[PDB]
Paper text:
Here, we determined the cryo-EM structure of IICBGlc solubilized and purified in n-dodecyl-β-D-maltopyranoside (DDM). The high-resolution cryo-EM map reveals the detergent micelle-embedded dimeric transporter, consisting of two identical IICGlc protomers that form a homodimeric complex. The absence of pronounced cryo-EM density in both the 2D projections and the 3D reconstructions suggests a linker-mediated flexibility of the IIBGlc domain, which may have hindered the determination of the complete structure of the IICBGlc protein. In contrast, the TD of the current structure is positioned within the membrane plane, representing an intermediate state between IF and OF. Interestingly, the other DDM molecule was found trapped in the IICGlc substrate-binding site located in the TD. Its maltose head group, which is a glucose disaccharide, is specifically bound via the foremost glucopyranosyl moiety, i.e., the glucose unit more distant relative to the alkyl tail. Specifically, E298 interacts with OH-4 and OH-6 (OH-6 is additionally coordinated by H211), T297 with OH-3 and OH-4, R203 with OH-3 and both K257 and E202 engage with hydrogen bonds with OH-2, while the OR is in contact with H212. In a broader context, the loop between TM7 and α3 is shifted by several angstroms in the DDM bound state, and especially the prominent phenyl group of F337 appears considerably displaced. Indeed, while the maltose head group competitively occupies the substrate-binding site, the bulky alkyl tail of DDM partially wraps around the phenyl group of F337, interacts hydrophobically with residues from the SD and displaces the entire TM7-α3 loop, thereby preventing the full occlusion of the thin gate. Therefore, DDM figuratively acts as a wedge, supported by the thin gate F337. These findings suggest that the elevator-type sliding motion across the SD/TD interface is impaired, resulting in a blockage of the transport cycle and gives rise to this DDM-induced intermediate stalled state.
Residue numbers in the entry:
A (entry chain A), B (entry chain B): 4 to 386
The structure:
């Protein structure tokens, strides 16, 4: 029965995913504070995009409520009512549990559950909906029967949940903090190898946008000489943090490996279909190379030849270790195409190695794909 | 075609209504800070109930989105995404438009649209859903087609809406402020006569909970000698404001008029049915008298004899003028039954007039109902 629940989990997370790229474009274009775009336009874009990121816990609460109730809007209302009661209950009870002043909890974020408290608030709303959406009350309460009971009981259950989270949360929030320091500073080779492999595994579903947020915007901290504080690999690299640039492995497979795989898919098509397939693969190899958008190459083989995608996910994972071990760094602000590679080159290290390790990634992806497509008779484009 | 839209308006507001009474019980029992109930329990109840009131704009945005999209949860998500972008856009643009520092706007609430910005954010989400929920994109954007486009375009439209509200809002927020001062201090006789009549008109639908919030919790301001600031007739009366107690008209029709109407409904039933009807009406007359809950008497005649309900709504309106003109004051914390009348009597004025004007309300409601039920042959309980 677990597969029918993994469908509901995926469905619940695709609502949050649907607003991440527009928020990232608004916050990116706005916070860049360009000279050619006016001051008020930049601030409105930054505060609009930053609003969608600040609402992420509530967006997750709604996605989980809708994904487990067959998209009923009263569950989304019940999740919004539950989340606000639960966050407020933790602010009252966490000071008592921790033995620290409420201003220390609030200023150090010691009781901040983030998206996890959103997921729990959605799980309350979904459970209360499926058990009570058909409840019959006595006639003196008949105006509040059925679906109208669900927000009320979700709010009452959010009190008890916020009390329990005030006891359970401190060892969880501590473990989340030690993971961030481990991934940024103690073993970035292992951490970013796991990030690249799991990101590839989530791309077929579009779920990688959620996985990218912590590594891009939350892992590690930097303060510059002006006292500005920066979190996550992307802001810390543009801020000039010498220990940023852990995401640089993306240039190897997005500029060299996947473009080379596209030519290996083209060269292995049947002759009658080889000319027609070539234009799809060129178009797709130039999109990956220039802009770092990879799905028109990935989706061309991913479903009909899953073994090529497992090899690609391994080689895309191993790309992040290689850059960290060789000491080759460069930034991204959108994705690892030639545009980000040239634009963000000012803070870079050993930039001349990306061509040299890249021709290795091109030889490896090309020769894997040509050999396996013939040998296994994989039904890639044109066969 | 307007009636099919008034159904959608009512349906959209009954979602917000469904969470008002639990929030009022939590905030009331919590903020009372009783000695018999422990300190942490009081604070958790107060902050839980206060959270549902603070979320009212967002709860209205969801109710309007769901009420105009046939309850689709992606419209509730789009309303949550729109509301947060629109509030943030006004915080950036209102300083520029007004020519005042952003800290003056934020501290004086000059750009705070309240529930009206919630309703607009829901109207964006509903419009964008009904125009775009079936949109077909080119294949490179196919993962974001259909319903997944609706939150994105609602967020983009929330930017332009927040810019327009930054120009349109200042003369609206000013008019809302002058209405509050008019209703509290300049013509409370006319204002609370309109409040009682319109409240009765909304009771058949349960919509009176929304109408009661501004008069009970937002009209007028009081500062006591300890410097605590209180808003709305209920908090200001318990705080000891000499100009509070405008809601005291409820004791006349809830303790005397409606109990008397219940005996007039009983006495006019056919003899075979008169004994059976008596117990419903006694039960219902004691519920109104003790606790100020009035629907078991109102709903007994309201649909089958609407003329009696129009007369009742007029007499319930006229009850608030009578108390303000005679200078008879008393508080409510739940509703105008004997419990609130005895409990809140300490801050009262001319308390001995409620029995004297009440026996007038009893004679008027009894004699209207007995005469009209016979004369018009109204099919009230037992006929
Ligand atoms: C697909 C299965 C696996 C996926 C899940 C694994 C990863 C866990 C999800 C990550 C949680 C996202 O968490 C959310 O991120 C954004 C962006 O950082 C934060 O946003 C915060 O920083 C951004 C700037 O970066 C501000 O614009 C925003 O105002 C702020 O509050 C949210 O406050 C946080 O709640
Ligand atoms: C459409 C252009 C808009 C202007 C962009 C320039 C503004 C600067 C800030 C933009 C931030 C974009 O944010 C970034 O987007 C890229 C591409 O979508 C995402 O990257 C991911 O998306 C695409 C498909 O969705 C994949 O092929 C790609 O391999 C994967 O890495 C990231 O998860 C995010 O880091
Ligand atoms: C049925 C048709 C006619 C009905 C509509 C006519 C009346 C207009 C609707 C009133 C709007 C309610 O507005 C909403 O009220 C509550 C309670 O005051 C406010 O709540 C505010 O005060 C309460 C205490 O009273 C706090 O607990 C809360 O933290 C706070 O932010 C909301 O911040 C405000 O947004
Ligand atoms: C169930 C008892 C719970 C304990 C109550 C004591 C705690 C003190 C704070 C309670 C606040 C209740 O809030 C108050 O509720 C009453 C009764 O619901 C409402 O009053 C309205 O509701 C009922 C029906 O719904 C009507 O018959 C009544 O005529 C009408 O005035 C008010 O709009 C609100 O002012």
């Amino acid at each position: 029965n677990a597969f029918a629940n993994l469908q509901k989990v995926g469905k619940s997370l695709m609502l949050p995913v649907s607003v991440l790229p527009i928020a990232g474009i608004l916050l990116g274009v706005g916070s860049a504070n360009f000279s050619w775009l006016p001051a008020v336009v930049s601030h409105v874009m930054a505060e609009a995009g930053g609003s969608v990121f600040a609402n992420m816990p509530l967006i997750f609460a709604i996605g989980v409520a809708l994904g487990f109730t067959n998209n009923d809007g009263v569950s989304a209302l019940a999740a919004v009512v539950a989340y606000g009661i639960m966050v407020k209950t933790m602010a009252v009870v966490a000071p008592l549990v921790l033995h620290l002043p409420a201003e220390e909890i609030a200023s150090k974020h010691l009781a901040d559950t983030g998206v996890l408290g959103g997921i729990i608030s959605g799980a309350i709303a979904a459970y209360m909906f499926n058990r009570f959406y058909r409840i019959k009350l006595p006639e003196y309460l008949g105006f509040f029967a059925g679906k109208r009971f669900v927000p009320i009981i979700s709010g009452l259950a959010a009190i008890f949940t916020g009390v329990v989270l005030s006891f359970i949360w401190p060892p969880i929030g501590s473990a989340i903090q030690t993971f961030s320091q481990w991934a940024a500073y103690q073993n970035p080779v292992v951490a970013f190898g796991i990030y690249g492999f799991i990101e590839r595994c989530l791309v077929p579903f579009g779920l990688h946008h959620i996985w990218n947020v912590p590594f891009q915007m939350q892992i590690g901290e930097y303060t510059n000489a002006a006292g500005q504080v920066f979190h996550g690999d992307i802001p810390r690299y543009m801020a000039g943090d010498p220990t940023a640039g852990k995401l640089s492995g993306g240039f190897l497979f997005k500029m060299y490996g996947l473009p080379a795989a596209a030519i290996a898919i083209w060269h292995s098509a049947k002759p009658e279909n080889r000319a027609k397939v070539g234009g799809i693969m060129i178009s797709a190899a130039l999109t990956s190379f220039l802009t770092g958008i990879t799905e028109p190459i990935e989706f061309s083989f991913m479903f009909v030849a899953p073994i090529l995608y497992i090899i690609h996910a391994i080689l895309a994972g191993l790309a992040f270790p290689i850059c960290i071990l060789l000491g080759m760094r460069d930034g991204t602000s959108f994705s690892h195409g030639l545009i980000d590679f040239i634009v963000l080159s000012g803070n870079s290290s050993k930039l001349w190695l990306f061509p040299i390790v890249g021709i290795g990634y091109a030889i490896v992806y090309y020769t894997i794909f040509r050999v396996l497509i013939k040998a296994l008779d994989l039904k890639t484009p044109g066969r």
